[PDB]
Amino acid sequence: NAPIETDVLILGGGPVGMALALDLAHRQVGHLVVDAGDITHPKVSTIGPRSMELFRRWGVAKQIRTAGWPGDHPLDAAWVTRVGGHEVYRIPLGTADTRATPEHTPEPDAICPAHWLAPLLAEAVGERLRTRSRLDSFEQRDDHVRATITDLRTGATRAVHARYLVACDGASSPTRKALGIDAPPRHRTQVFRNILFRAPELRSLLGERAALVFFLMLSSSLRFPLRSLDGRGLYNLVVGVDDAMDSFELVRRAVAFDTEIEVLSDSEWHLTHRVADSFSAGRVFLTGDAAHTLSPSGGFGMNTGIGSAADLGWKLAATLRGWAGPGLLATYEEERRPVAITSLEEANVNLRRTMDRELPPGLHDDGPRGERIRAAVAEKLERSGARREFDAPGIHFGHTYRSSIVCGEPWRPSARPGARAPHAWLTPTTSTLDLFGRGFVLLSFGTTDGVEAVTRAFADRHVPLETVTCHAPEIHALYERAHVLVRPDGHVAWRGDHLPAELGGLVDKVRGAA
Ligand SMILES: O=C1N[C@H](C(=O)O)c2c1c1c3ccccc3[nH]c1c1[nH]c3ccccc3c21
Numbered sequence: 190n191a192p193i194e195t196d197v198l199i200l201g202g203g204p205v206g207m208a209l210a211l212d213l214a215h216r217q218v219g220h221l222v223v224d225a226g227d228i229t230h231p232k233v234s235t236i237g238p239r240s241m242e243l244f245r246r247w248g249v250a251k252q253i254r255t256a257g258w259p260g261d262h263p264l265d266a267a268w269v270t271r272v273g274g275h276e277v278y279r280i281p282l283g284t285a286d287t288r289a290t291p292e293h294t295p296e297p298d299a300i301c302p303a304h305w306l307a308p309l310l311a312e313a314v315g316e317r318l319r320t321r322s323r324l325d326s327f328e329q330r331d332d333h334v335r336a337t338i339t340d341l342r343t344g345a346t347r348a349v350h351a352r353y354l355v356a357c358d359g360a361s362s363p364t365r366k367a368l369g370i371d372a373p374p375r376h377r378t379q380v381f382r383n384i385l386f387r388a389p390e391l392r393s394l395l396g397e398r399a400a401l402v403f404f405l406m407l408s409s410s411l412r413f414p415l416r417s418l419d420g421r422g423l424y425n426l427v428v429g430v431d432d433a434m435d436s437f438e439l440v441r442r443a444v445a446f447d448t449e450i451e452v453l454s455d456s457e458w459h460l461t462h463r464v465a466d467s468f469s470a471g472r473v474f475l476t477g478d479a480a481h482t483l484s485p486s487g488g489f490g491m492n493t494g495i496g497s498a499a500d501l502g503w504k505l506a507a508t509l510r511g512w513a514g515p516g517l518l519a520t521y522e523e524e525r526r527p528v529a530i531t532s533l534e535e536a537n538v539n540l541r542r543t544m545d546r547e548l549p550p551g552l553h554d555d556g557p558r559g560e561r562i563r564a565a566v567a568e569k570l571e572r573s574g575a576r577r578e579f580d581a582p583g584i585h586f587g588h589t590y591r592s593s594i595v596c597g598e599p600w601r602p603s604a605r606p607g608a609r610a611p612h613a614w615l616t617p618t619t620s621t622l623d624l625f626g627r628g629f630v631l632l633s634f635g636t637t638d639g640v641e642a643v644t645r646a647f648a649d650r651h652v653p654l655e656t657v658t659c660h661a662p663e664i665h666a667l668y669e670r671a672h673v674l675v676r677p678d679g680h681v682a683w684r685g686d687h688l689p690a691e692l693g694g695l696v697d698k699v700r701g702a703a
Pocket of ligand 1: 413486
């Protein structure tokens with residue numbers, strides 16, 4: 190009959206669309222997610238420690254850890270000639286259960302394939318997720334956007350009113366194409382096949398030699414990962430496709446065992462390096478793949494999209510509540526593009542590592558001449574810095590925003606402006622991270638002078654703000670300055686042992702007004 194009314198219309202029900210939905214939900218912003226219900230892309234099971242911190246904010250981290258990934262399954266990354274052949278190099282990474290509890294984060298990375306993450310994110314989001322719904326089209330108006338969604342379950346079509354429209358329609362984003370925004374390739378496009386197969390006993394056979402992922406060194410086409418998706422029988426084999434040999438043949442090539450193998454799917458997927466020239470066109474925005482696609486080498490892809498959705502999340506709400514400066518939305522691209530590009534390059538440095546590593550003559554050679562050749566590689570491989578692909582704390586946490594709303598100061602955790610406020614335990618159950626996520630938060634160590642001042646400045650502009658006084662010195666040390674200001678996203682916006690005189694000039698700068 191009449192149009193639907195919501196502030197933010199999310200296009201794309203994948204992890205990123207859901208993340209934006211969860212954060213917006215926690216900021217009390219009315220939204221609606223439409224997913225055609227009907228994405229040829231890498232497989233993607235890992236969730237970085239930074240994304241796990243965001244899900245902690247949203248109360249779903251636990252559900253993700255108990256989703257189904259077995260706790261006694263290895264997390265090792267192993268380089269081999271074949272899965273069951275000679276092992277060349279290995280990075281022990283323990284199991285989910287028994288492993289060193291991280292010191293720089295309260296939430297270590299996690300495993301949760303799509304056939305588990307999807308239902309999770311769906312329930313956490315609830316009714317505001319309209320599955321099996323297709324966007325017919327969208328027209329942009331002066332103060333809002335108008336779309337048309339067809340309920341693919343009933344056939345009915347419905348018009349939707351919305352202050353803003355955010356698209357997460359993947360790397361092929363129609364919305365981006367429609368907005369006439371381009372995303373030229375930052376690096377060469379390669380082709381790969383994702384062979385999903387089931388090996389009921391593959392794990393039993395391997396035993397202690399199992400691994401979250403196996404890097405193959407068997408051929409030009411078979412020198413790519415073989416991952417345990419659910420550590421319960423499901424596996425994915427990546428194989429390189431020259432520019433242009435059978436599914437079951439290949440899998441049987443990768444695995445040295447004579448055990449039951451059932452191929453479930455075998456599909457192509459382009460590996461691309463594309464960052465959109467723009468992240469928005471007026472009232473329509475772009476997140477995740479639609480704005481920045483990278484190589485899955487390092488799992489930076491999804492974390493950068495979830496990291497971007499969260500940034501757009503509090504900037505959308507702020508403009509909606511009316512307290513952000515008219516220039517704050519513009520900062521989404523100003524801060525998130527450079528991160529996407531930095532993560533893109535590093536992902537590429539991991540991809541290159543694998544492509545350039547030429548494979549020796551008698552590598553899969555048995556007995557010593559071979560044991561020695563393989564030993565050789567195990568060293569050059571480590572010399573090439575393989576571990577970087579799995580231990581990259583600088584990509585997960587190390588991203589400092591240099592922008593018009595961070596009073597900048599001209600790996601190891603820093604409370605440096607534009608950076609993510611470091612982790613520290615205030616109590617064995619509450620991390621400092623747990624204070625960030627709502628509105629601005631002012632931290633003070635020892636002193637409390639000048640706080641009544643800021644409290645009012647922010648209050649002058651309705652800018653939500655919380656002030657916390659902390660005491661232990663370890664944290665005070667870690668954060669350095671006496672007064673640290675954290676944005677709704679948990680990144681430092683300013684710090685110093687003394688609050689500057691005209692606070693209005695400050696509040697206005699951080700909210701993106703002046
Ligand atoms: O397809 C993938 N799927 C994996 C993914 O989902 O990113 C993946 C994939 C590939 C991958 C695929 C082709 C060539 C090199 C590659 N490195 C990787 C990866 N390196 C990682 C490090 C940590 C976590 C995941 C990966 C990874």
